[PDB]
Design an enzyme around this catalytic site. Structure first.
Site, short mmCIF file in Angstrom:
data_model
loop_
_atom_site.label_atom_id
_atom_site.label_comp_id
_atom_site.label_asym_id
_atom_site.label_seq_id
_atom_site.Cartn_x
_atom_site.Cartn_y
_atom_site.Cartn_z
N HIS A 41 0.83 -1.24 0.00
CA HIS A 41 0.00 0.00 0.00
C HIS A 41 0.86 1.29 0.00
CE1 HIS A 41 -0.06 -0.57 4.55
NE2 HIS A 41 0.14 0.75 4.48
N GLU A 72 0.77 -8.42 0.58
CA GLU A 72 0.96 -7.04 1.12
C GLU A 72 2.45 -6.74 1.33
OE1 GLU A 72 -1.32 -4.98 0.76
OE2 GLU A 72 -0.38 -3.26 1.79
N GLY A 146 1.18 5.55 11.10
CA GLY A 146 2.62 5.82 11.27
C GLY A 146 3.43 4.57 11.61
N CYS A 148 3.16 1.55 9.97
CA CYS A 148 3.22 0.60 8.83
C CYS A 148 4.67 0.51 8.36
CB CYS A 148 2.23 0.92 7.71
SG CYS A 148 0.51 0.57 8.19
#
Length: 182
Positions: A41, A72, A146, A148
């Site tokens: 992402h 991911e 914040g 990730c």
């Protein structure tokens, strides 16, 4: 404060950079040579900022399992003049549950942050922001925006990177040794 935090600090001090994309600032784990990982992402493009320096992306691969389901994880190769310490021998070979994990973050906003998240479940399937996702680890800590890209470790193992939360639980994508065979 103890051997969990000692292992986490050792990884943060040598194997992380601050990555910035058009989608924000992320903790980014360097694994070996010029190869690093970041949540998919983050939307990595042709250029990324590494510790506030303009850096060409030589390759970027959004990983999916053999059911063609999102994992991911994006593997990035960076046009950098220096190699990471090789930490592939700290990666698990198989999917597993863990005790006593630490989530470690380093951004402009959250420098030198370490969170004892406790027991980590092999959760498996998660609908992550609407996207079916496999190989998810879960921990019972109220993680926030914040975090990730944050690195999940136990003593002696680097097991995942933080990719989301639901306000009560946090979720990480597994790192497996097989992702980084060259």
């Amino acid at each position: 404060m103890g051997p969990g935090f000692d292992f986490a600090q050792a990884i943060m001090k040598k194997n992380t950079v601050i990555a910035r994309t058009e989608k924000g600032e992320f903790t980014m784990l360097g694994v070996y040579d010029r190869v690093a990982v970041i949540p998919t992402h983050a939307s990595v493009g042709e250029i990324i900022y590494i510790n506030d320096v303009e850096t060409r992306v030589l390759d970027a691969c959004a990983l999916r399992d053999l059911t063609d389901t999102n994992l991911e994880i994006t593997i990035v190769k960076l046009d950098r003049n220096q190699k990471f310490r090789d930490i592939r021998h700290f990666l698990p070979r198989c999917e597993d549950d863990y005790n006593d994990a630490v989530l470690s973050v380093h951004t402009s906003k959250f420098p030198n942050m370490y969170i004892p998240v406790g027991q980590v479940t092999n959760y498996g399937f998660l609908n992550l922001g609407g996207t079916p996702t496999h190989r998810i680890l879960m921990y019972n800590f109220p993680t926030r925006a914040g975090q990730c890209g944050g690195v999940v470790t136990t003593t002696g193992k680097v097991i995942g990177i933080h990719v989301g939360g639901n306000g009560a639980q946090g979720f990480a994508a597994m790192l497996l040794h097989s992702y980084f065979t060259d």
